[PDB]
Amino acid sequence: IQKTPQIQVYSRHPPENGKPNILNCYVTQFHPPHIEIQMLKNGKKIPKVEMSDMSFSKDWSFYILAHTEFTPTETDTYACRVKHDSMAEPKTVYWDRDM
């Protein structure tokens, strides 16, 4: 069975320029498990990205968390790019600090 991954991007604390925070990209409900996840700062790939919180739901679909430390700015934009067999083109979700 092939399930398309849901992609959620958000911060630990309400965004505040110049204040240390954490950026998360929760990729969920996908199957098969093979998947590529990349966090991006201004179109450039972020190096120190920690993967964690892997698990499955009742219907066995996979869940995985990608997060990294970051400090907001009125210019910087962040996104999460995901590649998965259930998608033709890689999908990019941008962080909406106004959500």
């Binding site: 954490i22 998360n24 969920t28 964690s52 106004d98």
Partner: protein
């Protein structure tokens, strides 16, 4: 209250690219505490929680061995299933397992579980009685016959009632500062304009622990779980969680809607409006 120990196990084959990837991730409640990934340079069973520093080197060696044993033995399971299902030797397939126990406040066993799935679907599972199995299809029915002949259920019951339960108690003890803490949700509401004098009100619950929480929107005392939008509670990257719930309301009529946050960190649930 009750606490649990869970292991999510995954084995994914990849013909033409080498041996199957094998992963073991362990949790005590909603907190990841151990992990094993066969795709790591030097595959070791490594701690994911700071309180796991209390385990000696023998523990890590033993677990690392058991894990590598499982990585090999699952390689055998993947080939076996190909036969059960008469499948091509060149496709990627997945075996998943959830294993663990649950204990109450007093530390006794409340629940035990061992559930397998193949290619994202139910395969076999140990029933709540911890004595009989339930097979999802004819393939799993073969495994069921073997495990009954080997007394697998009995072996798994001894593990759940003894080993599993005992490490869970030990884990809770060593990591009490972390596992038994209660982080209170911090809430707030955001406002968003919509076409045709309607607005989206969003209630956010942040930095709380444990994961379990309830977010409800009300109008004149009644709930709106029906026309409410939300996201599954999620991890925020520092061992805490967050969640949000939204509802669409008539412009100018915002003040009549309140958000209610219930959590075991809130001696009294929160109540916010915009």
């Amino acid at each position: 209250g009750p606490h649990s120990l869970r292991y999510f196990v995954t084995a994914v084959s990849r013909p033409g690219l080498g041996e199957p990837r094998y992963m073991e991730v362990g949790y005590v409640d909603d907190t990841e505490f151990v992990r094993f990934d066969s795709d790591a340079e030097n595959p070791r069973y490594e701690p994911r929680a700071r309180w796991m520093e209390q385990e000696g080197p023998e523990y890590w060696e033993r677990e690392t061995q058991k894990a590598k044993g499982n990585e090999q033995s699952f390689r055998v399971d993947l080939r076996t299933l190909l036969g059960y299902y008469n499948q091509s030797k060149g496709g990627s397939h997945t075996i998943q397992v959830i294993s663990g126990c649950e204990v109450g406040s007093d530390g006794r066993l409340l629940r035990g579980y061992q559930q397998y799935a193949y290619d994202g679907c139910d395969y076999i599972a140990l029933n709540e009685d911890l004595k009989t199995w339930t097979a999802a299809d004819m393939a799993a029915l073969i495994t069921k016959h073997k495990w009954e002949q080997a007394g697998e259920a009995e072996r798994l019951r001894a593990y759940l009632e003894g080993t599993c339960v005992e490490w869970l108690r030990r884990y809770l003890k060593n990591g009490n500062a972390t596992l038994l803490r209660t982080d209170s949700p911090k809430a707030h509401v955001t406002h968003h304009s919509r076409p045709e004098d309607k607005v989206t009100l969003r209630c956010w619950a942040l930095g709380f622990y444990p994961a379990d929480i309830t977010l409800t929107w009300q109008l004149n005392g009644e709930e709106l779980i029906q026309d409410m939008e939300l996201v599954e509670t999620r991890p925020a990257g520092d061992g805490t969680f967050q969640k949000w719930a939204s509802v669409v309301v008539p412009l100018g009529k915002e003040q009549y809607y309140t958000c209610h946050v219930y959590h075991q960190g809130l001696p009294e649930p929160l109540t916010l409006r915009w």
